[PDB]
């Protein structure tokens, strides 16, 4: 029965190790991702949460009938 239907304990042992490594890395990635989102939303210095401002190319830099702009 063991020879025909099953494998040795090493396969399950090392598959468990691989699965555990993947799961732990995903957990730490999720925690880091939440922290990064919080910091970016608080400070606004990252690529995320970049809310639009007025484009400066719309300004007209020509004389304006009056010296004082």
Site for ligand PLX, rule CB under 6 A: 5-7
Nearer to ligand PLX, 3 or 43 (CB): 3
Residue that has been written with the tokens 């691989």 in this structure:
18
- Whether 48 and 40 have beta carbons less than 8 Å apart is answered as yes
CB of 37 to ligand PLX, least distance (A): 43
Nearer to ligand PLX, 6 or 49 (CB): 6
- Residue closest to ligand PLX (Cβ): 5
CB of 18 to ligand PLX, least distance (A): 18
Cα separation, 53 vs 57, in Å, equals: 12
User: Please, is 16 exposed, middle or buried when counting C-beta atoms within 10 Å of its C-beta (0-12, 13-18, 19+)?
Assistant: exposed
């Amino acid at each position: 029965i063991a020879r025909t239907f099953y494998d040795g304990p090493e396969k399950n042992y090392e598959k468990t190790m691989a699965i555990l490594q993947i799961e732990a890395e995903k957990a730490e990635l999720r925690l880091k991702e939440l922290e990064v989102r919080r910091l970016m939303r608080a400070r606004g210095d990252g690529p995320w949460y970049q809310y639009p401002t007025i484009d400066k190319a719309l300004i007209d830099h020509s004389p304006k009938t009056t010296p004082d702009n």
